[PDB]
Amino acid sequence: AMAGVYTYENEFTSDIPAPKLFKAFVLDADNLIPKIAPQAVKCAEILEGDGGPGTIKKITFGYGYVKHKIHSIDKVNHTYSYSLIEGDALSENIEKIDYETKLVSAPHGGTIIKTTSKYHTKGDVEIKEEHVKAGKEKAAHLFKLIEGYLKDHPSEYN
Protein backbone atom coordinates (compact mmCIF):
# COMPACT_ATOMS: atom_id res chain seq x y z
CA ALA A 1 0.00 0.00 0.00
CA MET A 2 3.00 2.51 0.24
CA ALA A 3 2.73 5.07 -2.58
CA GLY A 4 5.92 6.68 -3.93
CA VAL A 5 7.66 7.85 -7.08
CA TYR A 6 10.83 6.63 -8.61
CA THR A 7 12.38 9.19 -10.94
CA TYR A 8 14.97 8.39 -13.52
CA GLU A 9 16.55 10.89 -15.90
CA ASN A 10 18.34 10.43 -19.23
CA GLU A 11 19.74 12.54 -22.06
CA PHE A 12 20.93 11.88 -25.61
CA THR A 13 22.09 14.17 -28.40
CA SER A 14 21.19 14.72 -32.12
CA ASP A 15 22.52 16.88 -34.98
CA ILE A 16 18.91 17.54 -36.02
CA PRO A 17 17.78 20.99 -34.98
CA ALA A 18 15.30 21.13 -32.10
CA PRO A 19 12.33 22.63 -33.92
CA LYS A 20 12.34 20.02 -36.68
CA LEU A 21 12.86 17.28 -34.20
CA PHE A 22 9.98 18.62 -32.15
CA LYS A 23 7.66 18.68 -35.16
CA ALA A 24 8.61 15.18 -36.31
CA PHE A 25 9.30 13.14 -33.14
CA VAL A 26 6.71 14.91 -30.95
CA LEU A 27 3.92 16.46 -32.88
CA ASP A 28 3.70 13.95 -35.79
CA ALA A 29 4.64 10.73 -34.00
CA ASP A 30 1.19 9.16 -34.88
CA ASN A 31 2.14 9.57 -38.52
CA LEU A 32 5.91 9.35 -38.69
CA ILE A 33 6.63 6.26 -36.60
CA PRO A 34 4.35 3.84 -38.51
CA LYS A 35 6.30 4.84 -41.59
CA ILE A 36 9.78 3.96 -40.38
CA ALA A 37 9.04 1.19 -37.90
CA PRO A 38 5.73 -0.55 -38.64
CA GLN A 39 6.42 -2.91 -35.71
CA ALA A 40 6.97 -0.23 -33.07
CA VAL A 41 3.65 1.43 -34.04
CA LYS A 42 1.04 -0.14 -36.34
CA CYS A 43 -1.68 2.31 -35.33
CA ALA A 44 -2.42 5.31 -33.06
CA GLU A 45 -6.02 6.37 -32.37
CA ILE A 46 -7.24 9.34 -30.34
CA LEU A 47 -10.01 8.19 -27.92
CA GLU A 48 -10.79 11.57 -26.38
CA GLY A 49 -9.70 15.11 -26.47
CA ASP A 50 -8.43 17.52 -29.07
CA GLY A 51 -4.79 16.33 -29.27
CA GLY A 52 -3.62 18.63 -26.44
CA PRO A 53 -3.82 18.34 -22.63
CA GLY A 54 -6.16 15.55 -21.44
CA THR A 55 -6.10 13.67 -24.76
CA ILE A 56 -6.19 9.92 -24.53
CA LYS A 57 -4.52 7.81 -27.19
CA LYS A 58 -4.49 4.06 -27.90
CA ILE A 59 -1.39 2.83 -29.55
CA THR A 60 -1.37 -0.60 -31.16
CA PHE A 61 1.88 -2.33 -32.06
CA GLY A 62 3.00 -5.24 -34.32
CA TYR A 63 1.43 -7.80 -30.40
CA GLY A 64 -0.56 -5.55 -27.92
CA TYR A 65 -1.36 -1.91 -27.14
CA VAL A 66 -0.94 0.96 -24.61
CA LYS A 67 -2.90 4.03 -23.70
CA HIS A 68 -1.25 7.42 -23.21
CA LYS A 69 -2.73 10.45 -21.54
CA ILE A 70 -1.18 13.76 -22.72
CA HIS A 71 -0.51 16.18 -19.86
CA SER A 72 1.08 19.13 -21.58
CA ILE A 73 2.55 20.30 -24.91
CA ASP A 74 4.63 23.50 -24.85
CA LYS A 75 5.36 24.11 -28.52
CA VAL A 76 7.24 27.28 -27.95
CA ASN A 77 9.58 25.81 -25.33
CA HIS A 78 9.75 22.41 -27.15
CA THR A 79 8.63 20.32 -24.12
CA TYR A 80 6.04 17.54 -23.93
CA SER A 81 4.68 15.33 -21.13
CA TYR A 82 2.31 12.35 -21.07
CA SER A 83 1.69 9.28 -18.93
CA LEU A 84 1.51 5.55 -19.76
CA ILE A 85 -1.83 4.77 -18.13
CA GLU A 86 -2.50 1.29 -19.59
CA GLY A 87 -0.15 -1.39 -20.83
CA ASP A 88 2.21 -4.23 -19.94
CA ALA A 89 4.86 -2.12 -18.12
CA LEU A 90 2.15 -1.40 -15.55
CA SER A 91 1.10 -3.73 -12.68
CA GLU A 92 -0.20 -3.62 -9.06
CA ASN A 93 3.36 -2.43 -8.19
CA ILE A 94 3.69 0.23 -10.97
CA GLU A 95 0.37 1.95 -11.46
CA LYS A 96 1.49 4.47 -13.99
CA ILE A 97 4.51 6.05 -15.56
CA ASP A 98 4.90 9.81 -16.40
CA TYR A 99 7.30 10.93 -19.10
CA GLU A 100 8.56 14.45 -19.61
CA THR A 101 10.76 15.28 -22.55
CA LYS A 102 12.57 18.56 -23.23
CA LEU A 103 14.41 19.42 -26.42
CA VAL A 104 17.17 21.84 -25.74
CA SER A 105 19.25 23.66 -28.38
CA ALA A 106 22.85 22.63 -28.36
CA PRO A 107 25.79 25.01 -29.00
CA HIS A 108 26.37 23.97 -32.64
CA GLY A 109 22.78 23.76 -33.91
CA GLY A 110 21.79 20.23 -32.83
CA THR A 111 19.71 19.10 -29.83
CA ILE A 112 19.97 17.62 -26.35
CA ILE A 113 16.91 15.55 -25.63
CA LYS A 114 16.29 15.27 -21.90
CA THR A 115 13.76 12.71 -20.58
CA THR A 116 12.49 12.26 -17.03
CA SER A 117 10.59 9.06 -16.25
CA LYS A 118 8.50 8.98 -13.08
CA TYR A 119 7.18 5.56 -12.00
CA HIS A 120 4.26 5.82 -9.58
CA THR A 121 4.80 2.83 -7.26
CA LYS A 122 2.64 0.96 -4.69
CA GLY A 123 4.24 -1.28 -2.03
CA ASP A 124 7.79 -2.53 -2.16
CA VAL A 125 9.71 -1.05 -5.01
CA GLU A 126 11.48 -3.29 -7.44
CA ILE A 127 12.92 -1.77 -10.59
CA LYS A 128 15.63 -3.57 -12.46
CA GLU A 129 18.56 -1.72 -13.99
CA GLU A 130 18.29 -4.19 -16.91
CA HIS A 131 14.69 -3.32 -17.77
CA VAL A 132 15.48 0.41 -17.61
CA LYS A 133 18.48 -0.08 -19.88
CA ALA A 134 16.55 -2.34 -22.35
CA GLY A 135 14.00 0.51 -22.55
CA LYS A 136 16.68 3.11 -23.36
CA GLU A 137 18.40 0.92 -26.01
CA LYS A 138 14.99 0.27 -27.68
CA ALA A 139 14.17 3.93 -27.73
CA ALA A 140 17.64 4.81 -29.05
CA HIS A 141 17.31 2.39 -31.94
CA LEU A 142 14.06 3.99 -32.92
CA PHE A 143 15.38 7.47 -32.45
CA LYS A 144 18.27 6.67 -34.82
CA LEU A 145 15.69 5.64 -37.42
CA ILE A 146 13.79 8.93 -37.05
CA GLU A 147 17.06 10.83 -37.51
CA GLY A 148 17.79 8.78 -40.65
CA TYR A 149 14.35 9.57 -42.06
CA LEU A 150 14.79 13.30 -41.44
CA LYS A 151 18.16 13.31 -43.15
CA ASP A 152 16.67 11.29 -46.09
CA HIS A 153 13.76 13.85 -46.54
CA PRO A 154 15.20 17.22 -45.89
CA SER A 155 12.18 19.14 -47.21
CA GLU A 156 9.99 17.72 -44.36
CA TYR A 157 9.30 19.32 -40.94
CA ASN A 158 10.98 22.62 -41.62
Author numbering: -1 to 60, 65 to 160
Q: What does the article say, verbatim?
A:
The Fra a 1E protein crystallized in two different crystal forms. The two crystal forms belong to the same space group (P212121) but show different unit cell dimensions and molecular arrangement. The refined model contained two molecules of Fra a 1E in the asymmetric unit. As can be appreciated in Fig. 3a, the structure of Fra a 1E conforms to the START fold and consists of a seven-stranded β-sheet, two short helical segments between strands 5 and 7, and a long α-helix at the C terminus. The β-sheet adopts a slightly curved shape with the long C-terminal α-helix (α3) juxtaposed against the concave side, which creates a cavity in the middle of the protein. The open end of the cavity was surrounded by loops α2-β2, β3-β4, β5-β6, and β7-α3, designated here, respectively, as L3 (amino acids 35–39), L5 (amino acids 60–65), L7 (amino acids 89–96), and L9 (amino acids 125–130), and by the N-terminal half of the last α-helix (α3).
Fra a proteins are members of the pathogenesis-related 10 family and are required for the normal accumulation of flavonoids and the development of color in strawberry fruits. The data presented here demonstrates that Fra a proteins bind natural flavonoids, providing for the first time mechanistic insight on the function of these proteins in the control of flavonoid biosynthesis.
